[PDB]
Design an enzyme around this catalytic site. Sequence first.
Site, short mmCIF file in Angstrom:
data_model
loop_
_atom_site.label_atom_id
_atom_site.label_comp_id
_atom_site.label_asym_id
_atom_site.label_seq_id
_atom_site.Cartn_x
_atom_site.Cartn_y
_atom_site.Cartn_z
N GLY A 153 43.02 33.34 35.84
CA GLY A 153 44.14 33.13 34.84
C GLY A 153 44.99 32.20 35.17
O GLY A 153 45.48 31.33 34.69
N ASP A 198 49.52 39.37 31.07
CA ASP A 198 49.21 40.48 31.86
C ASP A 198 49.87 41.77 31.76
O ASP A 198 51.20 41.69 31.35
CB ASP A 198 49.11 40.19 33.53
CG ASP A 198 47.89 40.89 34.19
OD1 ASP A 198 47.83 42.06 34.00
OD2 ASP A 198 47.29 39.91 34.75
N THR A 210 35.66 37.51 30.95
CA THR A 210 35.50 38.79 31.61
C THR A 210 34.07 39.11 31.44
O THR A 210 33.21 39.01 30.32
CB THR A 210 36.14 39.90 30.59
OG1 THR A 210 37.54 39.55 30.39
CG2 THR A 210 36.06 41.26 31.15
N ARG A 265 26.87 24.28 39.08
CA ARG A 265 26.45 24.74 40.11
C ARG A 265 24.82 24.05 40.34
O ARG A 265 24.49 23.64 41.45
CB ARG A 265 26.28 26.24 40.32
CG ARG A 265 27.60 26.83 40.68
CD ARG A 265 27.49 28.26 40.42
NE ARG A 265 29.00 29.07 40.64
CZ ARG A 265 29.04 30.37 40.59
NH1 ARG A 265 28.37 31.05 39.65
NH2 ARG A 265 30.31 30.75 41.02
N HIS A 299 24.35 35.16 31.40
CA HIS A 299 25.07 35.08 32.60
C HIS A 299 24.81 36.17 33.68
O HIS A 299 25.58 37.04 33.82
CB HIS A 299 26.64 34.91 32.54
CG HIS A 299 27.25 34.58 33.83
ND1 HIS A 299 27.09 33.42 34.41
CD2 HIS A 299 28.38 34.95 34.26
CE1 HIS A 299 27.94 33.05 35.52
NE2 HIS A 299 28.64 34.26 35.53
N1 LIG Z 1 31.92 34.01 33.13
C1 LIG Z 1 31.85 33.69 34.75
O1 LIG Z 1 31.08 32.91 34.98
C2 LIG Z 1 32.68 34.37 35.54
C3 LIG Z 1 32.88 33.70 36.82
C4 LIG Z 1 33.74 34.53 37.69
C5 LIG Z 1 34.36 35.51 37.25
N2 LIG Z 1 34.21 36.16 36.01
C6 LIG Z 1 34.75 37.64 35.75
O2 LIG Z 1 36.09 37.06 35.16
C7 LIG Z 1 37.08 38.20 35.21
C8 LIG Z 1 38.08 37.71 35.96
O3 LIG Z 1 38.14 37.34 37.30
P1 LIG Z 1 39.45 37.52 38.11
O4 LIG Z 1 38.92 36.78 39.63
O5 LIG Z 1 40.58 36.61 37.54
O6 LIG Z 1 39.68 39.11 38.28
P2 LIG Z 1 41.25 39.68 38.51
O7 LIG Z 1 41.20 41.12 39.07
O8 LIG Z 1 41.90 38.72 39.47
O9 LIG Z 1 42.04 39.34 37.24
C9 LIG Z 1 42.11 40.28 36.35
C10 LIG Z 1 43.32 40.69 35.55
O10 LIG Z 1 43.33 41.22 34.36
C11 LIG Z 1 44.33 42.14 34.24
N3 LIG Z 1 44.27 43.21 33.18
C12 LIG Z 1 43.83 44.34 33.59
N4 LIG Z 1 43.71 45.10 32.48
C13 LIG Z 1 44.37 44.34 31.34
C14 LIG Z 1 44.58 44.71 30.12
N5 LIG Z 1 44.12 45.75 29.50
N6 LIG Z 1 45.06 43.37 29.47
C15 LIG Z 1 45.62 42.48 30.02
N7 LIG Z 1 45.26 42.09 31.32
C16 LIG Z 1 44.63 43.09 32.05
C17 LIG Z 1 44.86 42.56 35.47
O11 LIG Z 1 46.20 42.97 35.70
C18 LIG Z 1 44.23 41.22 36.48
O12 LIG Z 1 45.30 40.49 37.02
C19 LIG Z 1 36.26 39.28 36.16
O13 LIG Z 1 35.73 40.24 35.50
C20 LIG Z 1 35.01 38.62 36.76
O14 LIG Z 1 33.85 39.35 36.80
C21 LIG Z 1 33.74 35.47 35.13
#
Ligand SMILES: NC(=O)c1ccc[n+]([C@@H]2O[C@H](COP(=O)([O-])OP(=O)(O)OC[C@H]3O[C@@H](n4cnc5c(N)ncnc54)[C@H](O)[C@@H]3O)[C@@H](O)[C@H]2O)c1
Lengths: 317, 317, 317, 317
Positions: free
Chosen positions: D16, D35, D121, D153, D177
């Site tokens: 984010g 958030d 997500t 990648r 994915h």
């Molecule tokens: N699509 C892809 O290729 C890809 C690649 C990498 C990561 N991801 C995924 O993306 C997601 C985010 O990764 P990240 O490293 O930013 O995780 P992170 O834990 O750093 O960030 C997640 C955020 O979501 C917030 N959150 C929790 N519940 C919430 C709600 N109800 N409403 C709003 N916000 C809320 C948390 O406070 C946190 O800041 C993960 O699920 C990860 O698996 C996807």
Amino acid sequence: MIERRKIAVIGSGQIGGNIAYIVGKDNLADVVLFDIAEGIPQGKALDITHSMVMFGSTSKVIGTNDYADISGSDVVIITASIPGRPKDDRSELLFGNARILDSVAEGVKKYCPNAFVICITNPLDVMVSHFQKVSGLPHNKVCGMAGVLDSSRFRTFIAQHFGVNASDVSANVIGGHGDGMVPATSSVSVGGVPLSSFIKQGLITQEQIDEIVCHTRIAWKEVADNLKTGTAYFAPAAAAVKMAEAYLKDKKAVVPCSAFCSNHYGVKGIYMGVPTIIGKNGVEDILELDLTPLEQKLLGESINEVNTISKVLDNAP
Amino acid sequence: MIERRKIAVIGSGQIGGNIAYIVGKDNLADVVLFDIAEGIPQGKALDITHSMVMFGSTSKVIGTNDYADISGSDVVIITASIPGRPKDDRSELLFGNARILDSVAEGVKKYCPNAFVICITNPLDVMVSHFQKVSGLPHNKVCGMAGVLDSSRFRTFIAQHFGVNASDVSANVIGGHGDGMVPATSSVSVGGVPLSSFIKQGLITQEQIDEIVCHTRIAWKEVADNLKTGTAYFAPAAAAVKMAEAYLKDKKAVVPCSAFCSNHYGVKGIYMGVPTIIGKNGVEDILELDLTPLEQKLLGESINEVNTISKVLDNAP
Amino acid sequence: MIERRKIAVIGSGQIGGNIAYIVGKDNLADVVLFDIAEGIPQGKALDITHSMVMFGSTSKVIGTNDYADISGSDVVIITASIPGRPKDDRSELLFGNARILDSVAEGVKKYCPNAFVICITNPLDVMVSHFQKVSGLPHNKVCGMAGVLDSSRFRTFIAQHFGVNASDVSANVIGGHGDGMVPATSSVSVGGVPLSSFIKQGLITQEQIDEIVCHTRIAWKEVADNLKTGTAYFAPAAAAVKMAEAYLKDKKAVVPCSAFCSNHYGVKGIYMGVPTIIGKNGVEDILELDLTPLEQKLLGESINEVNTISKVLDNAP
Amino acid sequence: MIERRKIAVIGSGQIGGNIAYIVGKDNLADVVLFDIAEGIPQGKALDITHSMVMFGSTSKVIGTNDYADISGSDVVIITASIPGRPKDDRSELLFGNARILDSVAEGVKKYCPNAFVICITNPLDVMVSHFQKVSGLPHNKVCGMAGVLDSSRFRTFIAQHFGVNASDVSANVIGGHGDGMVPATSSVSVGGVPLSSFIKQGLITQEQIDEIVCHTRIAWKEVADNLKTGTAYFAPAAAAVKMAEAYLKDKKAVVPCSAFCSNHYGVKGIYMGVPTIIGKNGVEDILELDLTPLEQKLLGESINEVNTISKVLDNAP
Ligand SMILES: NC(=O)c1ccc[n+]([C@@H]2O[C@H](COP(=O)([O-])OP(=O)(O)OC[C@H]3O[C@@H](n4cnc5c(N)ncnc54)[C@H](O)[C@@H]3O)[C@@H](O)[C@H]2O)c1
Ligand SMILES: NC(=O)c1ccc[n+]([C@@H]2O[C@H](COP(=O)([O-])OP(=O)(O)OC[C@H]3O[C@@H](n4cnc5c(N)ncnc54)[C@H](O)[C@@H]3O)[C@@H](O)[C@H]2O)c1
Ligand SMILES: NC(=O)c1ccc[n+]([C@@H]2O[C@H](COP(=O)([O-])OP(=O)(O)OC[C@H]3O[C@@H](n4cnc5c(N)ncnc54)[C@H](O)[C@@H]3O)[C@@H](O)[C@H]2O)c1
Ligand SMILES: NC(=O)c1ccc[n+]([C@@H]2O[C@H](COP(=O)([O-])OP(=O)(O)OC[C@H]3O[C@@H](n4cnc5c(N)ncnc54)[C@H](O)[C@@H]3O)[C@@H](O)[C@H]2O)c1
């Protein structure tokens, strides 16, 4: 220590001025605009200098008629040409522009023999070969801008048919920068999808592909006939800057350009349009496309076209 | 709903083409190049279109002679003008360009009346006033490019003296785009340091300041004398683009331009060069510089000079 | 010949990773992410590497724990620090981070003694002085990032009050990167207009200016208290990149930073925040602002604050 | 009427914050960081706001815990997730994140139902399908970021083998994915040259191709194993920005993403990774790659793998 990059533009006409403008805007290097015509490069450089602060660039751009000022240039881009647009063939400029490049070759050999030379002056492929011969600079440090312009046009026309982002079209033009240039339809793709699939889907016809190939080949006349008093200059300048970027930033970029091809495409040493790798040591490699027998033949005809014009120059007045 | 930003360039000569080029390169908007001369805008648009894939831009650039094509334009930039450089005064073009802008005003009024209009055509300040009258567009949606060009030159010459980056020089030129333009030395700073401090420090002399002021006022001639066809066009194009950016991206940017000043600087309703705030609603504000008595006097003379030429236009024999 | 620019980031934590990300995105240089913690720089470099193609950059970014890999670096940016955010003063890290810089100094002195060193590690001004002392690198080739961050905050808060583009606000913060930092209100301008005029116009009050000065001084706590588990890192990384740009592109940019001031501001040899000119030879000059007696006093107090912390380090365990 | 583009980032963690940073730097739009955790989005927004003047951007970036603040968002990007890296499978987060996206879907439905939604997500493909159901947004205005990351990648690893610029590699990853993602080697080209030609030329072995394919599939672990808090976040942020760009600038860009495929690839209604055309109307088209029999089989397995996890979610005990 750190020194600013330096690009010398030999010929400060339509294309030359645009190169300096874009190079200055991007802050890729300092620019030296060289021309024999008094006033022109000085006026353009001052004008472009006023724009630098607007672009947030600290590039220095100066005009000159003194080859000493191109000393220590990392890249030399040659646009210098005799006046008057070609009536219906780029080869009409052959005899005059050959003599110009003799002069340019002496300035470069004296003041910046280690520069990467990008030739633009027409007839492109023969002018590049002539420059390397007279200057004596290494083959890998001398090439011609052409393929980037021809392929960009090829890509754009394909993109305009499908209504897609032209950056997502992969398409090459090879061979000499003339009527004989070969837009290789066989290796065209749109986001990975080859043209054969689009034909099956009814989204493009082979006649439309043929129109696009023809349009690519004659594109220079379409632009010229509309401009009236000259030939294309916005895109050719942009193309030269892309090539300069590839060298200065050591990109290892795939650049279709006129390079000395000796162990590819069934030729044993000739300057012609081919896909190259460009980095800090100039033309570092050549890639071999999978051509169809028809495309291999068309390439052969382009090769003959280059040799013909090349032999004419050898028997010049 | 997302729509592409659209910029109309009315007049596709030296400045017009550069605007389309830079706008396209930056992917700021789509571009419609308008001109009465046949081929010219179509030729430049095609050439510039071929460069779009090189720059990694999806901007459309088209040429036309039909005002219907500028329909829905967000910004309109007017470079349309009679040919030939002014000999030594921009007012020489008065009546010719006034008639040109009548038809432009009609085109804009009919097809894109809600557009932000940036006038470039000389004599700048009067042309802006004339266009607004005939077009009937709101005063805040009509302005002239001048101050950015003049201020950029001023900044550039200040920066060249100290050997510093011009982007770190704050400097304004106000008043009409003519010999009576006022480079406000009192408001000049270099990284926070004013010119008064540089005098006391012995890093600049009042004489050198006077040379810079003079150099700014006659900068147009220096370029024009060297080009030998027409006047400056690389920097004016860029200046207009900066103004377009400020509008399209709602920057709330400080932009010295010819705007309708009806309270500030002791005037009640006149178009002249002043530092404005430009955003999504056009000229959203005007800033009052802290001018010396001398600068107030020089500005007054510029106002008279502008009112003179305006009055000459109002009396059509 | 041409070689790629190379930036070494010593410390691949919050700030360090962002620097590599932005440097890679801009294609300013190749990046070497150094850290003693296993995995961290390798993981960040691989992640950032995958983004390069998305940004259209050919920058190479690698992670390492080997000082040999920073060999031939043009710029070294030091972010390395002991863990745990300062409770309420940057000086709490003084003893630990001093020892870290002893180690970093040996790596730099061995593998890239001709590099331009930009220190970020707190307590900034004392850490910079300590590094120059231990490394023995020339004063002009060692400085600290601080003023760009402090001034950017100062400019931004002013800009947010007036609702204007922050790039059009000229405003400096000088002195040590601590509570004693001096946002010099006397040289603040908005598009050339000084704060005194805005006060007269009723558009800002002196109390609002005082709130902005205070806010600038305590800004680090506001960010930290919201982030919870650390201190600011997006803006500090961006600031370091701007400084790196100034050196690598020889901008002659006006950069407020912690530099060795010996013949200005009434000091005879001390590292503190001052407006500098940065180009290819590092800190090439220092500019002298016109400070009010109150501001000269506040600067004096900041100087005493730096000397106090500096003397504590001299009498460390 | 001009309005600033607006992007909402739902979830202000690793990805984010990077999105807000890059969007702000590029001045692509204003940003609302949302958030539930207190301070975090406000802290990052303030920090990032201080960097805006450094980048020369007027983008606003704010933090919030109130869905009313995402009102009028043009694009919404969802990174909201439960904490902690997956041990060795993205499906582990299924039920937690499904509940999170319910409230996000409610927020978007109420305050910005016309927005283009880019889900990040994990488990990506299922989350996208779930969000679309609960939110009731059109299928073409809801999609998932995955293919750009996976394809980047793939391109990067291909480019690293040949020692060429990754931007000149055309390569697609399709399907879900997950471990069953399909790097389509058949559609790979390097400057127009396919992998088959590189085999015959002896510049790559089928074994090396298989290693690259495998490396792509497990690339997430390589990064995650080194970071030691969470998973990749620099490149995923950038990938989402490219997708946002395509929408906001109406690029008609080829974007591999998780989209509702209801005809192509022998499926009648499912969210999976496919090459799309993204423009102002969201996912405007889907392209059919010329897949081998093997690749059709591998894709079929991915479809089953995606349907499995989707079916598990539908049966809420
Ligand atoms: N699509 C892809 O290729 C890809 C690649 C990498 C990561 N991801 C995924 O993306 C997601 C985010 O990764 P990240 O490293 O930013 O995780 P992170 O834990 O750093 O960030 C997640 C955020 O979501 C917030 N959150 C929790 N519940 C919430 C709600 N109800 N409403 C709003 N916000 C809320 C948390 O406070 C946190 O800041 C993960 O699920 C990860 O698996 C996807
Ligand atoms: N390779 C390509 O794809 C391509 C594309 C377009 C144009 N071109 C060619 O590029 C060349 C330049 O085009 P242009 O529109 O810029 O031409 P132009 O007439 O606008 O500019 C040519 C400039 O060269 C200068 N000049 C003449 N003799 C010189 C000498 N001995 N040394 C230095 N300068 C000299 C002239 O003063 C003039 O300013 C032409 O030959 C044209 O055919 C090539
Ligand atoms: N404001 C400034 O600071 C500034 C700076 C430089 C130049 N200028 C002025 O800007 C103007 C443009 O300069 P240029 O070098 O581009 O001139 P130019 O002659 O190159 O271009 C003018 C174009 O206007 C076109 N035109 C003529 N009549 C027209 C009509 N009725 N409708 C539409 N188009 C028409 C012509 O075909 C021509 O292409 C000039 O008047 C010049 O004095 C202003
Ligand atoms: N000058 C400024 O304006 C300014 C602004 C913000 C933060 N800072 C300072 O910058 C520093 C870095 O902040 P951060 O958020 O990146 O910290 P961080 O904790 O996120 O990162 C510090 C990194 O340094 C590494 N490290 C520790 N010892 C090391 C050694 N001997 N050699 C190399 N690396 C080592 C750690 O492994 C860690 O990855 C802090 O001291 C902070 O106070 C300065």
